[model samples]
Target: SHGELTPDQQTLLHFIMDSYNKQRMPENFLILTEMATNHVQVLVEFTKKLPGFQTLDHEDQIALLKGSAVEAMFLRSAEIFNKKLPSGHSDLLEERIRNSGISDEYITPMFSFYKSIGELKMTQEEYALLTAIVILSPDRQYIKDREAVEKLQEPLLDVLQKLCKIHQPENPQHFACLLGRLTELRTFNHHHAEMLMSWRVNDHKFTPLLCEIWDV
Candidate 1:
């Protein structure tokens, strides 16, 4: 049935790709902090464009954005990491993040998740739909109207499932594999909180936007 990205989905895919292409690899913890702030800003703009997103209650909107930001950031980062880069560029980016003052424990799982995402070789449309599905998650804490969120998420999930079937005919379970990443992503929320506190303990500064979105 739905064999292609709808006009609105096309817009969403282009919007994310445009912002994603503009990003530069952060060289250190300080630059990574700024990069994260910019990513969140872009995410907010992207979320606002999702069809039916603005129709949610105002409080629900904030809760969805706040709750999903970290997961979405990781997903986007994974996509960036998987993109074709000049020889050694991805390695350099990995090295920078590994040495960026985050603890050893978190680094392993973070990169593992990135590697798993790379294995999927998702297209831009899949990435966009996955992101929309992530942000529309209804189970986040402080959600006042779970049903409304689910309503929006269901169609996106259907579209992505159909896309996975079309895009990866050789792998019938590709859609299931993609959804599994979301499960892995949820664990990062706890690790991310610890990472933030560790950075704060070292007297690192986060931008106002970062502080607001992350509640730091």
Candidate 2:
């Protein structure tokens, strides 16, 4: 039955799997970094295509994106924790980050966060809604109209709560945990910036697009 998801579920399959195939993911970190940058860009592109997202002012759009991109990327990274490498190994991207000179201090906590989030074993539909909620966050810094943004996010939150009841009825508290993950994600965004800054000073070799997005 899990494999027999509805048309709506079919649509969310890609987001849960990085919107790209693990078989096609590049092995090299530089190339992988490019893919990661493109991954974030593509998510933003698709979010704009969604209803209500583009209706905001262009300035608000940029503000939302700058504020939310890192958290969204962390959500995207959670997919890597779920995916397997060509060698049948999991955590391919996670391992790559640890080896990419990001330091244990940065990654150990992220790894813990990923594990806890993954333990929810969210369905594709849940992840899709969750991703939308993260992108449409009301509290993201610089959001021009917090009230309006919260209104936009409300419907999805309703849907997510219902899904939580249907999918994890054993734990009515699951919705609270899911919401808590967003707080953890905010912290990750801060650490991610610090890691990138160190990488910039030491490596000095990231894609132009990445530099632009990171504002390095």
Candidate 3:
């Protein structure tokens, strides 16, 4: 049972966050809850198509199923967001959004999909993407306060480093634990890659953020 929970879970009590937060099959209501029963089989069909299905044993198949389920939920959601966000918080990100041609829809809904899988913060790939975004576009956010960002980063680094050392082939709990910490960043970090481009401006702010990331 995923009875053990962290702060974000306790504070941000919402059905969309909970049933979906750490579950193998995320329960986020943000996706098409009404359609979930009717629509999910379409994604299940796609999951069956993913590589290595025949290769995995029973347990591995289940793990893959769980992951694929979450991923499938996201694909359906992509249609919903069409990728438009109203705030346009960061111009660089705005361009990325425009370049990507995401509509003014589904952006928030997409956040729900990522959040459902505890990807509300930096996904492993997003970390690198963030670095690039910050580097390329530097003016999104100026250094408002240096001390706050740095203060939280050290502990975050220690934790990330510990998780990186994790040996593979463990139970879903292992990966789930790592993702739980990632979800914490929802409190501290922004979800959008474009929004993150702004945080890169301040050397002090950006430095600590990078310090927490795993290079590999």
Candidate 4:
């Protein structure tokens, strides 16, 4: 339904995340949320600009497009929803949660509130979820949330700036600047919590031995 990841990222991500001494994601969430997809597209675009990617084998490129899209989606959505990644595109992800057994009561209200939220519902939710992820369990029950992103206001603005640096899609090449606008969606999601998407592929997704004290 959404972009997929490469075998390399899959193998590497699991291996890397496991080495984190703090807490590891209990489940391999193949989140295909819409914003997640958009996020992946942005990364793919970045890769395409690089020489190695431009010269990659056809199959590798396809694989990267698929897998990276999902990674981008999760990371980008985390950025948008502040780490929650379920605000602007909540409707798109309701089906996944439904299968997960949460509840329509917990979700349906959100569906109704998807597009609007008082003066600004969207950003409010994003902020809420990001903080929630930082605060509690959106998915992994064992992962000890760092919650560091929640305390700093400048970092929140910095997150926005990072997303903005990415080129906006003029014609919709799958990913584009959707990640950037999603911030407005995030700000609308909630007024609490925060997101720290930089954690994606930084240093902890694979090489546990390579883990450093600085990342956490």
User: Which candidate has the top score in TM-score?
Assistant: 1
List ranges where model 4 is wrong by over 4 Å.
Answer: 1-37, 83-216
lDDT of 1 at 43: 85
> Of 1 and 2, which scores higher on lDDT?
1
Question: How well does each candidate superpose onto the true structure, as a TM-score?
Answer: 0.87, 0.80, 0.26, 0.24
Candidate 2 structure lDDT? 0.70
Q: Which ranges in model 2 have alpha carbons more than 4 Å from their true place?
A: 1-29, 83-88, 91-95
Which regions of candidate 1 fall more than 4 Å away from where they truly are?
Answer: 1-28, 84-87
A best-first ranking of the candidates according to their TM-score comes to 1, 2, 3, 4
lDDT of 4 at 113: 33
Q: Quick one: ranking by lDDT, best first?
A: 1, 2, 3, 4
Residue-level lDDT tens digits of model 2 in 1-216: 243445554444434344332222344556658766767676666567544776787777777777777877777767555543333355565677667767886888788877878888876667667877887888877777888788778866776787788788899899998998878878987788777777667776777777666677
Kindly list the per-residue Cα lDDT of model 3 for residues 1-216, writing each as its tens digit: 112324442222232223222222222222223344433454444334322234434544443343233333443343223323333433444455444433444355445443453432333322222211111121213433334333333333333333333333344354455445333323322233343343344322323212232100
Go through the candidates in order and give each one's C-alpha lDDT: 0.82, 0.70, 0.34, 0.33
Model 4: per-residue lDDT, tens digit, 16-35? 22321121121222342333
Tell me, by lDDT, which candidate is best: 1
Q: Model 3: what TM-score?
A: 0.26
